[PDB]
Amino acid sequence: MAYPMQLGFQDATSPIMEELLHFHDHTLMIVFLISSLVLYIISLMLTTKLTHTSTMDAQEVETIWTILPAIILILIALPSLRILYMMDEINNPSLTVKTMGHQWYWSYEYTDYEDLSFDSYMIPTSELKPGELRLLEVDNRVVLPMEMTIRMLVSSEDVLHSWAVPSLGLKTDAIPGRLNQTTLMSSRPGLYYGQCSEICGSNHSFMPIVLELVPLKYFEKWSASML
Amino acid sequence: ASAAKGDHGGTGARTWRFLTFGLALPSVALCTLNSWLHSGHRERPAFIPYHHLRIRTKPFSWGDGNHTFFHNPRVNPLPTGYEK
Amino acid sequence: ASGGGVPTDEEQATGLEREVMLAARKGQDPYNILAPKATSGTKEDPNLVPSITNKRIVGCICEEDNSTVIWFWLHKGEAQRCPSCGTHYKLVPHQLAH
Amino acid sequence: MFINRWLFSTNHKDIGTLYLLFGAWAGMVGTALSLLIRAELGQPGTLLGDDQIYNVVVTAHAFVMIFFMVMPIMIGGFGNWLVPLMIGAPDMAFPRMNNMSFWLLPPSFLLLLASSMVEAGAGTGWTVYPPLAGNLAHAGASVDLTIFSLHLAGVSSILGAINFITTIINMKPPAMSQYQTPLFVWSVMITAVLLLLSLPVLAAGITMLLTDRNLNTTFFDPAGGGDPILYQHLFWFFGHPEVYILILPGFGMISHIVTYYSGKKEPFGYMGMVWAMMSIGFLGFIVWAHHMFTVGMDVDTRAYFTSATMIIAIPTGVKVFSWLATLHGGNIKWSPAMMWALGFIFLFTVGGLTGIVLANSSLDIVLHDTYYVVAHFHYVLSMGAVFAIMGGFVHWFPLFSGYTLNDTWAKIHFAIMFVGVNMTFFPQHFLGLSGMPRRYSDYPDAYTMWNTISSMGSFISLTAVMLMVFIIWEAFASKREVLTVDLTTTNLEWLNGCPPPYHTFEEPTYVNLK
Amino acid sequence: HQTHAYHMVNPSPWPLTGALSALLMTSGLTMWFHFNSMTLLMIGLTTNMLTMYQWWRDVIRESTFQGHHTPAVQKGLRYGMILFIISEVLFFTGFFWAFYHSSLAPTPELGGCWPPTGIHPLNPLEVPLLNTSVLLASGVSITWAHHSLMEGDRKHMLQALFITITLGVYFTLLQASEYYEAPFTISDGVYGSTFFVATGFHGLHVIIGSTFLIVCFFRQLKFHFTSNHHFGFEAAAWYWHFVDVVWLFLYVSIYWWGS
Amino acid sequence: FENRVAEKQKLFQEDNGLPVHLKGGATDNILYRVTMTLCLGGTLYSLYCLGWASFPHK
Amino acid sequence: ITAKPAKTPTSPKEQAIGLSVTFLSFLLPAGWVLYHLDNYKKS
Amino acid sequence: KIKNYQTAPFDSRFPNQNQTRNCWQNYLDFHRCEKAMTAKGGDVSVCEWYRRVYKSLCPISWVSTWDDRRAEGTFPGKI
Amino acid sequence: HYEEGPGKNIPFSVENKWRLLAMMTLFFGSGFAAPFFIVRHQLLKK
Numbered sequence A: 001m002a003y004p005m006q007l008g009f010q011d012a013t014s015p016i017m018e019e020l021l022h023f024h025d026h027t028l029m030i031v032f033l034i035s036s037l038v039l040y041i042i043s044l045m046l047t048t049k050l051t052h053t054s055t056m057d058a059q060e061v062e063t064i065w066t067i068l069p070a071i072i073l074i075l076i077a078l079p080s081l082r083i084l085y086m087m088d089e090i091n092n093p094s095l096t097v098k099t100m101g102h103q104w105y106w107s108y109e110y111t112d113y114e115d116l117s118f119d120s121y122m123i124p125t126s127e128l129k130p131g132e133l134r135l136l137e138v139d140n141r142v143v144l145p146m147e148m149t150i151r152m153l154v155s156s157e158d159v160l161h162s163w164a165v166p167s168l169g170l171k172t173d174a175i176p177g178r179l180n181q182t183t184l185m186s187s188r189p190g191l192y193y194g195q196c197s198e199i200c201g202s203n204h205s206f207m208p209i210v211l212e213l214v215p216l217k218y219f220e221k222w223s224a225s226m227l
Numbered sequence B: 001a002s003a004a005k006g007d008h009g010g011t012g013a014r015t016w017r018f019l020t021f022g023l024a025l026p027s028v029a030l031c032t033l034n035s036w037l038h039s040g041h042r043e044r045p046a047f048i049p050y051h052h053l054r055i056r057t058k059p060f061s062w063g064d065g066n067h068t069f070f071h072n073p074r075v076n077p078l079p080t081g082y083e084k
Numbered sequence C: 001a002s003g004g005g006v007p008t009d010e011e012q013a014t015g016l017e018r019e020v021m022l023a024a025r026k027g028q029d030p031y032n033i034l035a036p037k038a039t040s041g042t043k044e045d046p047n048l049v050p051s052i053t054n055k056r057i058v059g060c061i062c063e064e065d066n067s068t069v070i071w072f073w074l075h076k077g078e079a080q081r082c083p084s085c086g087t088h089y090k091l092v093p094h095q096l097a098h
Numbered sequence D: 001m002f003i004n005r006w007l008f009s010t011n012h013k014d015i016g017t018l019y020l021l022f023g024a025w026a027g028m029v030g031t032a033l034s035l036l037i038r039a040e041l042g043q044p045g046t047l048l049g050d051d052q053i054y055n056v057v058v059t060a061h062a063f064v065m066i067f068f069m070v071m072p073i074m075i076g077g078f079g080n081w082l083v084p085l086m087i088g089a090p091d092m093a094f095p096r097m098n099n100m101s102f103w104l105l106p107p108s109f110l111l112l113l114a115s116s117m118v119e120a121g122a123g124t125g126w127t128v129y130p131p132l133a134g135n136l137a138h139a140g141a142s143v144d145l146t147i148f149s150l151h152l153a154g155v156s157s158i159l160g161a162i163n164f165i166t167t168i169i170n171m172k173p174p175a176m177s178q179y180q181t182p183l184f185v186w187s188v189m190i191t192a193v194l195l196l197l198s199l200p201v202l203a204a205g206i207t208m209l210l211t212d213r214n215l216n217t218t219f220f221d222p223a224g225g226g227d228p229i230l231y232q233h234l235f236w237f238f239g240h241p242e243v244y245i246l247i248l249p250g251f252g253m254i255s256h257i258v259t260y261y262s263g264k265k266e267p268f269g270y271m272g273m274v275w276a277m278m279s280i281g282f283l284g285f286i287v288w289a290h291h292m293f294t295v296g297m298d299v300d301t302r303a304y305f306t307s308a309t310m311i312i313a314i315p316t317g318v319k320v321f322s323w324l325a326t327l328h329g330g331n332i333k334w335s336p337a338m339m340w341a342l343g344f345i346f347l348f349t350v351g352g353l354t355g356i357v358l359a360n361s362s363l364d365i366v367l368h369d370t371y372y373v374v375a376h377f378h379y380v381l382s383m384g385a386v387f388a389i390m391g392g393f394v395h396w397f398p399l400f401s402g403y404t405l406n407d408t409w410a411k412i413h414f415a416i417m418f419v420g421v422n423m424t425f426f427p428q429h430f431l432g433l434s435g436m437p438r439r440y441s442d443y444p445d446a447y448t449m450w451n452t453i454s455s456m457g458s459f460i461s462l463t464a465v466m467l468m469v470f471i472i473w474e475a476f477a478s479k480r481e482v483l484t485v486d487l488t489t490t491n492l493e494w495l496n497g498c499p500p501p502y503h504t505f506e507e508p509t510y511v512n513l514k
Numbered sequence E: 001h002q003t004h005a006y007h008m009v010n011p012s013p014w015p016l017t018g019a020l021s022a023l024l025m026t027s028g029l030t031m032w033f034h035f036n037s038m039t040l041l042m043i044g045l046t047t048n049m050l051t052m053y054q055w056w057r058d059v060i061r062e063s064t065f066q067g068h069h070t071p072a073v074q075k076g077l078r079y080g081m082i083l084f085i086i087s088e089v090l091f092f093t094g095f096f097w098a099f100y101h102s103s104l105a106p107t108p109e110l111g112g113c114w115p116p117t118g119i120h121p122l123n124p125l126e127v128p129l130l131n132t133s134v135l136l137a138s139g140v141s142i143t144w145a146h147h148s149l150m151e152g153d154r155k156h157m158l159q160a161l162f163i164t165i166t167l168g169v170y171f172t173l174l175q176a177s178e179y180y181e182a183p184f185t186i187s188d189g190v191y192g193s194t195f196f197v198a199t200g201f202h203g204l205h206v207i208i209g210s211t212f213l214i215v216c217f218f219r220q221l222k223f224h225f226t227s228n229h230h231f232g233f234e235a236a237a238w239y240w241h242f243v244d245v246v247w248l249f250l251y252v253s254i255y256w257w258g259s
Numbered sequence F: 001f002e003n004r005v006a007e008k009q010k011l012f013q014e015d016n017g018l019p020v021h022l023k024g025g026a027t028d029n030i031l032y033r034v035t036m037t038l039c040l041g042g043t044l045y046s047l048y049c050l051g052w053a054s055f056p057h058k
Numbered sequence G: 001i002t003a004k005p006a007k008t009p010t011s012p013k014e015q016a017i018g019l020s021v022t023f024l025s026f027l028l029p030a031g032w033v034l035y036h037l038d039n040y041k042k043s
Numbered sequence H: 001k002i003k004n005y006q007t008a009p010f011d012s013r014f015p016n017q018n019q020t021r022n023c024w025q026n027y028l029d030f031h032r033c034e035k036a037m038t039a040k041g042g043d044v045s046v047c048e049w050y051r052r053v054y055k056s057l058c059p060i061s062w063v064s065t066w067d068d069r070r071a072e073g074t075f076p077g078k079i
Numbered sequence I: 001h002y003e004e005g006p007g008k009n010i011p012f013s014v015e016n017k018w019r020l021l022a023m024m025t026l027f028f029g030s031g032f033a034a035p036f037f038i039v040r041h042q043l044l045k046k
């Protein structure tokens, strides 16, 4: 979750979102380089009395400020494209879980073995147990085994939603009739919070996602009890 | 291709008329022959109430709002089997 | 298929369209459809600029393939020159509308 | 002699002015709509009611600014005003079709406003994605009125584009090639071409959505084997060219401002600038799917679309660096216009760079539907497109009205605006990175500081906007007629005085061949 | 008195009456689809019909009788017409995109196949083939009209022009029939949707082109066109050929491959 | 059919200082006025309707 | 850009009126609507 | 019989993020296998794998709906 | 022939600066005002 006065990303819970941190540092580095140059050079032009209003030669420097920006783009593209394939990579998982968006809640389904399924709504502002976060708390949490490659399938049953957990590097639109996939894998147990990342009308701000990651042991036991 | 006929060096409206009457319209006549010569009604398709057909999400703005614009009871059923 | 009965422009073109056609025949451009052909542009042989009034915007293209036209009002009377290259221009009012 | 002038016009200038007047008004609507948004996020909690009436405001904000503010000011106003004056044409090719191009817009706006008064109205976002925009989740004339708004606004722009292209090709002097037209004329033509190809696809897309809502078609409805994604492809295929339609005439005016106020006779690297625009024009058509990295397309496709988006940086960089090369060795007159222009160049560059961030399909996973996007696009529109309009306005206002502005006041305006918009949008970067979604009317607790500061920003912007209305009055109040204009040899638009006659170029320019 | 060759149009109310008629048509549809009345839509159609009659009358008045269409003006009208046709092409492209999207990736609710389960397609070797032969022939005939016109033959221009018009009317009736006798409706899945919107929109452009040819026929009757000046007819022949071609792609896409 | 264009030219090029859209005769003037009337009639009516459409109904 | 002198100069006085009128015309109509937001939900 | 099954593995036939096809196919494969094996005096436990894989991957509302449509005789898939 | 020159080439009169002040005040004022009244009108249905 976001902490007040936050500047950058939520800390990285999955090793994919770690990866996306350092690629962003790499990119921002290049962004500051370029936006500083443009400012400096703007300041360089405005702060001299010297003049040269006659004709200047176009064909000469055009090569430099076309070739360098091309170089620089390759420095951004190479890792961006590496991480892209790394995200989508072959993974043979230990669990499949589905989630369906609705107006205005998420329903989750674990059906490798049984027919374990449940809804999961926001805890309205005026029913929180002191310590509980406004607009981010669900009654039924999505409980999952930590340190294990989990397949998430994301569809919806009404309008578009999108299932986002920023701390994990996940976001996958929920589309009706469409069964979108994404691998989920947490390095650490805990509570991790996300929110609906597409417009669905009335209660779009108020349909959050909370993952609870726990060891395999306590997950298997959570299954039985919910049956 | 170059078709199979001949001309291109005796050009003008004459040629184009020659084509209009010697090719185009005879083609329209042959096709009109063929077509009014596979006619006679095709046995109407046994109704099944498939859920991906006869889509009603909102009444049409005419009639009983269950009848499409060029509706033909001979062949187009409503959502609840054929008419009479 | 050559019967007859379709009028020609000669016959049935009117208005400004006609006057343009009739001009073109003689070799005259009253309504400025052709580009004017330049001269040496010296004091002796200036570029003759037909106007109707007492002034008319000249555009000079000082060197073939310059991407910037040089614009200025040419006034009646004495041959003025371009601010960029000093080629000479003279206004030669009238004719045009007989 | 009034109705014959202002309701029945066949005159590029007066049509320009109507466009400018329509856009002025429209702005105020959008400006008001913008504060209603920041008001609602200015302190934690609800103000208005729910996301529905909020996203009506958000939705209508976007449409009003894009279609009724920026596009009519730039392409309709400055377009109709300057184009013929800059190439020596007595008027546009199709002056009567031109006037309908305008008169379709008030009817279009009316329809859009009616969208928001009936039922709960159009609370879908400017994207108008189904199934939300469908008859089930959005019954009643709500959406169908929006669709018809865009139809009418779509036809305005097309009939205009046909005009601009026809005019700019056909009505130059005999001796003037296209490589001798000013850089603004070039920016309008290209813009027009992007309009002509893009809008028809949108029209089809929203016409298909319409049939889905009313004639029981199932284009987007999985029920009938439809696909919600197919809309996104069709919408975005226009959607991206549009964002380039909104900035290309800016590029044009900025090239003209920077040259004029560093006292060069031409901007640096003309053919390069021309080239850059065409390249940006072309590459803008093969990128649409970079608004769709979270819908679940093939990796290999996302790979393609990442790389293809990035390349635009190159022709755009050529343009940025060329403007600088124009300032180089200039006698820099620090006019209000020139401040707007320099503003553009830095702040635009910044908005563009956050664009390059987002172009990474990998990273965009995390930043899609987050306020980071809202920052990126408010940098290039609110401090890019808009600074270019403001700079255009104050530079050329003398040519339109015949009266000069007060430069002091105009500089006061720049300063206020500059701080406001920056204070408004800069913090949103953090809001985006931290994980605050788009189209939210309340937020978790941690997002409170940055949203607060932001909303305090939007107010300084109001003060600026209000102030400008005064500044224009003041101009007209005092009545300072124009004596003499600088550098008219290389700026034809100024060569018939201020304002120039109803009929300019009755007798056309003389241009030698050689 | 100007000394250039372009046309400075006399102020006209038609832009306003057309823009306003646009409002009524749009309102009127919205009324009809929801609150059930047709009154507005009618009035819109009428104000629109009147705006077009009058705008285009004036264009004829300006050109044929006033002589404002100089070579300059007339070359400008060609660019306009071509550019219009380009946007129209792009418009149709949206509908083909739609069809191809659906038919190459058939969803499970169709049975994962094209055509969908339950859809019985028209036979292309029957009437769609007829229609194809009809329009192509109308392309040959219109071309004959154009050569006759350039050669100054009034009888033959009018004869071939009539033939053309007739073949378009014939297509329209054939199509209106197939529509009625068709065993699927606009409502019957995405097959129906893609089929009827796309063919429907084309059908509409056939009526418009026929109407446009019909106008050229009457203008020709009343001696307007000369052997070198007759843009109205050209513009029509282009539009007609455009229509010819859009049909050809419908045939190959929706009727042949999509069955 | 005979060639009456020669005439129509003369009528339409006449100096009477009326614009092209009324220059034909008195027919135009009515047709013009019918057109405009209806547009204004319609526009008021569509506003009327917008009025109606905003507030819900028992 | 040389300007001629103001034909009808707008005195610091007048300017002050102009500015005020202009800011109220924005700020009242809004403020009124804005003030009554509790009265619109809970009538 | 080749079990000890955790969940549906990766199938190269459906390698991307749109897994719609995966559910649809495996569901068909099963009910085709089930149909065929009853009607030729054989065992249904051979078809059991496809059952698991569709049951795993498919949403429940989808399988609900398809099983309702088969019983109703309006299931658009060839079986 | 239509009127040309400063202040004459616009659909509104800048003859008297206070008449103009009000003109402009109602013009821009309405525009800025309109969204608020919509939000109001929307709230008074339920």
Ligand SMILES: CCCCCCCCCCCCCCCCCC(=O)OCC(COC(=O)CCCCCCCCCCCCCCCCC)OC(=O)CCCCCCCCCCCCCCCCC
Pocket (backbone or CB within 6 Å): A007, A008, A009, A028, A031, A032, A035, A036, A039, D350, D422, D423, D426, D427, D429, D430
């Ligand atoms: C208004 C809010 C102020 C908030 C200040 C931050 C609080 C610090 C807590 C101090 C807390 C420090 C301890 C924690 C470490 C943070 C690690 C982290 O999470 O890492 C990520 C953080 C770290 O980012 C930073 O590296 C600091 C962000 C500030 C960037 C420098 C510009 C500041 C200019 C003046 C103020 C802004 C207003 C003017 C805006 C001007 C428009 C560009 O957040 C970002 O990535 C923001 C990305 C925004 C992209 C903007 C594009 C560049 C435009 C500016 C170029 C100027 C260069 C020339 C030189 C400068 C020329 C002007």
Ligand code: HEA
Pocket (backbone or CB within 6 Å): A034, A038, A068, A069, A070, A072, A073, D243, D244, D246, D247, D290, D291, D309, D310, D312, D313, D314, D316, D317, D318, D320, D348, D349, D350, D351, D352, D353, D355, D356, D358, D359, D360, D364, D367, D368, D369, D373, D376, D377, D380, D381, D384, D385
């Ligand atoms: C005028 C409007 C405008 C302009 C000009 C741009 C310009 C660009 N935009 Fe943006 N964009 C929008 C308006 C605009 N955009 C809007 C409104 C949205 C939101 C849509 C919605 O509502 O959902 C959006 C969204 C958007 C997204 C979607 C994010 C998401 O929703 O998930 C992306 C992703 O790639 C993107 C990319 C770009 C890029 C690469 C440019 C390029 O043109 C950048 C060009 C400029 C530079 C790159 C800087 C100048 C160059 C140099 C100084 C040279 C050297 C540079 C380098 C070496 C890098 N834009």
Ligand code: HEA
Pocket (backbone or CB within 6 Å): D020, D023, D024, D026, D027, D028, D031, D034, D035, D037, D038, D058, D059, D061, D062, D063, D065, D066, D070, D073, D124, D125, D126, D127, D374, D378, D381, D382, D385, D386, D389, D390, D393, D421, D424, D437, D438, D439, D440, D441, D458, D461, D462, D465
């Ligand atoms: C041109 C386009 C444009 C402009 C100028 C603006 C201007 C502003 N925008 Fe807007 N905005 C969008 C286009 C624009 N916006 C789009 C497309 C979206 C996405 C919609 C969606 O999610 O669906 C959006 C979304 C958006 C959101 C997201 C809400 C949410 O998702 O939760 C917010 C929040 O702060 C916001 C705020 C602002 C603010 C404070 C301004 C301020 O900068 C406004 C201050 C006013 C001005 C800068 C204009 C002043 C100038 C004139 C009026 C011209 C004067 C006339 C003459 C001289 C002739 N905008």
Ligand SMILES: CCCCC/C=C\C/C=C\C/C=C\C/C=C\CCCC(=O)O[C@H](COC(=O)CCCCCCCCCCCCCCCCC)COP(=O)(O)OCCN
Pocket (backbone or CB within 6 Å): B001, B002, B003, B004, B005, B006, B007, B008
């Ligand atoms: C799966 C498919 C796999 C295959 C794919 C491979 C290829 C695709 C096909 C084609 C692309 C190949 C090449 C194109 C490149 C260049 C073509 C150059 C032609 C050109 O442009 O030449 C010009 C045109 O010439 C002229 O007239 C034109 C003269 C014409 C001469 C021939 C005419 C006589 C032949 C018989 C005509 C047939 C009549 C048809 C009507 C019958 C219909 C049934 C030169 O003008 P010119 O001679 O001065 O005119 C003098 C005429 N008086």
Ligand SMILES: CCCCC/C=C\C/C=C\C/C=C\C/C=C\CCCC(=O)O[C@H](COC(=O)CCCCCCCCCCCCCCCCC)COP(=O)(O)OCCN
Pocket (backbone or CB within 6 Å): B068, B069, B070, B071, B072, B076, D151, D154, D155, D203, D207, D210, D215, E172, E175, E176, E179, E180, E181, E182, E183, E184, E185, E186, E187, E196, E197, E200, E201, E203, E204
């Ligand atoms: C035979 C060729 C001639 C066709 C034209 C004749 C009459 C209709 C009039 C106008 C149609 C204009 C455009 C086409 C619009 C929609 C496609 C309609 C296609 C059609 O006409 O097909 C009919 C459907 O009509 C229906 O329901 C709907 C009934 C028609 C009214 C629909 C409402 C109009 C929608 C307007 C949207 C226009 C937006 C365009 C924007 C302009 C460009 C910017 C078929 O009937 P069916 O029973 O489903 O199947 C046959 C069963 N045996």
Ligand SMILES: CCCCC/C=C\C/C=C\C/C=C\C/C=C\CCCC(=O)O[C@H](COC(=O)CCCCCCCCCCCCCCCCC)COP(=O)(O)OCCN
Pocket (backbone or CB within 6 Å): D165, D193, E078, E079, E082, E083, E085, E089, E092, E093, E096, E238, E241, E242, E245, E246, E249
């Ligand atoms: C499965 C998907 C299905 C969808 C497919 C659907 C349909 C298929 C597509 C098209 C077919 C349709 C109709 C064809 C029928 C008739 C068209 C009209 C033919 C015609 O008659 O046009 C002629 C030729 O057009 C010309 O050159 C052209 C003139 C163009 C002028 C406007 C130019 C503005 C645009 C930019 C042009 C680019 C220039 C080249 C360089 C660009 C670099 C990229 C007219 O010549 P003209 O202009 O007088 O010459 C003067 C020029 N000096």
Ligand SMILES: CCCCC/C=C/C/C=C\CCCCCCCC(=O)O[C@H](COC(=O)CCCCCCCCCCCCCCC)COP(=O)(O)OCC[N+](C)(C)C
Pocket (backbone or CB within 6 Å): A041, A055, A056, A057, A060, A061, A064, A065, A068, A069, D321, D324, D325, D328
């Ligand atoms: C990706 C990051 C971006 C990369 C940016 C890198 C940019 C490289 C910048 C500068 C390179 C150094 C210049 C080298 C080229 C030769 C310079 C030169 O030679 O300068 C002038 C040439 O003039 C002329 O054409 C015209 C003037 C010289 C050409 C330079 C003008 C443009 C410079 C750009 C301005 C800064 C913008 C930088 C963009 C980031 C010298 O004029 P003289 O009076 O002596 O001659 C007149 C005739 N004599 C001999 C008879 C007197």
Ligand SMILES: CCCCCC/C=C\CCCCCCCCCC(=O)O[C@H](COC(=O)CCCCCCCCCCCCCCC)COP(=O)(O)OC[C@@H](O)CO
Pocket (backbone or CB within 6 Å): D093, D094, D095, D096, D097, D098, D151, D152, D155, D158, D162, D199, D200, D203, E007, E009, E018, E019, E021, E022, E025, E026, E051, E052, E055, E058, E059, E060, E062, E063, E068, E073, E077, E080, E081, E084, E087, E088, E091
């Ligand atoms: C669902 C309901 C939505 C309804 C939306 C309807 C919108 C508007 C309705 C009103 C439109 C019809 C009124 C007639 C318009 C015809 C204009 C025209 O035909 O004008 C011509 C210009 O266009 C040329 O050339 C060539 C270009 C001709 C353009 C034809 C315009 C047709 C209007 C519709 C455009 C459809 C675009 C579709 C593509 C997405 C002539 O130019 P003018 O400057 O006029 O005169 C110049 C003189 O020198 C001539 O002597």
Ligand SMILES: CCCCCC/C=C\CCCCCCCCCC(=O)O[C@H](COC(=O)CCCCCCCCCCCCCCC)COP(=O)(O)OC[C@@H](O)CO
Pocket (backbone or CB within 6 Å): C012, C013, E056, E057, E059, E060, E063, E064, E069, E077, E081, E207, E208, E209, E211, E212, E215, E224, E225, E226, E229, E230, E231, E232, E233, E235
């Ligand atoms: C229920 C459905 C109904 C739909 C309503 C629309 C119905 C029918 C529209 C039919 C089109 C009629 C257009 C007739 C144009 C007449 C004017 C004309 O033809 O104008 C010509 C000029 O070109 C010009 O402007 C030519 C102007 C371009 C005209 C092209 C118009 C295309 C219109 C398409 C509009 C619908 C778009 C589709 C939207 C889905 C006149 O010059 P010439 O011919 O050279 O003559 C001069 C010589 O006589 C002298 O020597």
Ligand SMILES: CCCCCCCCCCO[C@@H]1O[C@H](CO)[C@@H](O[C@H]2O[C@H](CO)[C@@H](O)[C@H](O)[C@H]2O)[C@H](O)[C@H]1O
Pocket (backbone or CB within 6 Å): B061, B062, B063, E038
């Ligand atoms: C983009 C271009 C868009 C082109 C224009 C859209 C064209 C829409 C045309 C609709 O035309 C109407 O359709 C009705 C068919 O329902 C007809 O009869 C209807 O009229 C009566 C009046 O309400 C009903 O009560 C009757 O039952 C019913 O048959 C009516 O005559 C006809 O005019």
Ligand SMILES: CCCCCCCCCCO[C@@H]1O[C@H](CO)[C@@H](O[C@H]2O[C@H](CO)[C@@H](O)[C@H](O)[C@H]2O)[C@H](O)[C@H]1O
Pocket (backbone or CB within 6 Å): D035, G027, G028, G029, G030, G031, G032, G034, G035
């Ligand atoms: C986002 C743009 C808006 C920013 C805020 C604008 C700043 C306020 C300027 C004008 O505001 C006034 O505020 C008063 C509140 O003090 C309102 O009077 C209200 O309260 C008064 C008592 O305090 C009573 O006289 C009135 O009946 C009652 O309407 C009054 O109508 C309103 O014009």
Ligand SMILES: C[C@H](CCC(=O)O)[C@H]1CC[C@H]2[C@@H]3[C@H](O)C[C@@H]4C[C@H](O)CC[C@]4(C)[C@H]3C[C@H](O)[C@]12C
Pocket (backbone or CB within 6 Å): A062, A063, A064, A066, D271, D272, D275, D318
């Ligand atoms: C050749 C052409 C115009 C020359 C003319 O006819 O005036 C010029 C204009 C802009 C030039 C391009 C731009 O300067 C950007 C690139 C700069 C590099 O120096 C070469 C490739 C590069 C892509 C250039 C190639 C070429 O010299 C272009 C395309």
Ligand SMILES: C[C@H](CCC(=O)O)[C@H]1CC[C@H]2[C@@H]3[C@H](O)C[C@@H]4C[C@H](O)CC[C@]4(C)[C@H]3C[C@H](O)[C@]12C
Pocket (backbone or CB within 6 Å): D230, D233, D289, D300, D301, D304, E101
């Ligand atoms: C996005 C669009 C399909 C949209 C739709 O489903 O309607 C498809 C059609 C053809 C595709 C392209 C073509 O397959 C060619 C390329 C194939 C490569 O594997 C990816 C990039 C590539 C350039 C594709 C990108 C994208 O997936 C395209 C453009």
Ligand code: CUA
Pocket (backbone or CB within 6 Å): A101, A102, A104, A160, A161, A162, A196, A197, A198, A199, A200, A201, A203, A204, A205, A207
């Ligand atoms: Cu669900 Cu937003």
Ligand SMILES: [O-][O-]
Pocket (backbone or CB within 6 Å): D239, D240, D243
């Ligand atoms: O599109 O940015």
Ligand SMILES: [Cu+2]
Pocket (backbone or CB within 6 Å): D239, D240, D243, D288, D290, D291
């Ligand atoms: Cu984009």
